[PDB]
Design a protein that fits this description.
The structure is a homodimer.
Chain A: E1 2-8, E2 15-22, E3 29-36, E4 41-48, E5 83-89, E6 95-101, E7 116-120, E8 143-148, E9 150-151
Bound molecules: ~{N}-[(3-methoxyphenyl)methyl]-2-selanyl-benzamide (2 copies), chloride ion (2 copies) and zinc ion (ZN) (3 copies).
């Protein structure tokens, strides 16, 4: 019933299109699309709090964390709402994204509309990095590309 | 009390930053910012229905029109929610935007978060152009720049 979309762009050559679809306000969100221009391997994938691209991806602020929790992976009870883990780029630098998430929403509350989706330089350690930053950002490094999450037809 | 922001970009020289602020949920929205790279004179200024920039500004669809009205100017009863009239560029190609609007909102069914803000090639005739297109688009021509309307800090 609800469909939202995000175009990922940045200061480098990373670009992507990410779709989100939610059948019921109570339901899981299906996340699918493609990102290119990435280094092979894991890249942290998160919804950040602000849909503000004024100065590029830095203006999006921290991970979306309406419930004041620590950073984790998407399968964890202890996570930020915005914690979608990692996408994986192949040797051609392409990530084919296919995620199902029960914590993000497109309606009701915990809504990601108007926020920023960010793909990161490094792997998200999912809060298992063994340092203080692990349970805040997952040590995923800089913001390679981002976009504001908008309502689709 | 609620703040939202939009970065306008397109295929050519037009770029801008637009801020929106609403003190009360029932209250007027203040709209301010600047756009550059424009031809001198009036440029139609609209919130479009989809926050979909996947194929540039064309994917944003028609004017945001949750109340199924005809096109008009911001100071008309008969208007789309997204009808913000025109911004005015000077001989340097700069529009300094300063609008207060009582119809758009930053909450509820009039909310513009997750929609697209578009600045157009031509003047919006505010539905007074007398042709059929006047009461749909205002004859404002192509989409020079746009962005998804996001939540700000
Ligand atoms: Se408004 C609107 C329109 C479309 C989708 C979501 C929303 C919305 O109300 N989102 C929640 C929210 C939470 C914090 C701040 C905010 O605006 C600044 C909106
Ligand atoms: C379609 O008509 C609407 C009716 C009420 C609210 C809205 C916009 N606000 C929301 O949808 C919203 C509000 C609070 C938390 C999360 C979300 Se997603 C639209
Ligand atoms: Cl971060
Ligand atoms: Cl149009
Ligand atoms: Zn997090
Ligand atoms: Zn328009
Ligand atoms: Zn209109």
């Amino acid at each position: 019933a609800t469909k939202v979309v995000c175009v990922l762009k940045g200061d480098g050559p990373v670009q992507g299109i990410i779709n989100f679809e939610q059948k019921e306000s109570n339901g899981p969100v299906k996340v699918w699309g493609s990102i290119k221009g990435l280094t092979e391997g894991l890249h942290g994938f998160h919804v950040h709090e602000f849909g503000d691209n004024t100065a590029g991806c830095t203006s999006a602020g921290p991970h979306f964390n309406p419930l004041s929790r620590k950073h984790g992976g998407p399968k964890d009870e202890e996570r930020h709402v915005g914690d979608l883990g990692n996408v994986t780029a192949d040797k051609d630098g392409v990530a084919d994204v296919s995620i199902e998430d029960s914590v993000i929403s497109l309606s009701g509350d915990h809504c990601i509309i108007g926020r920023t989706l960010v793909v990161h330089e490094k792997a998200d350690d999912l809060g298992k990095g063994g340092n203080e930053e692990s349970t805040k950002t997952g040590n995923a490094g800089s913001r390679l590309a981002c976009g504001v999450i908008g309502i689709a037809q």
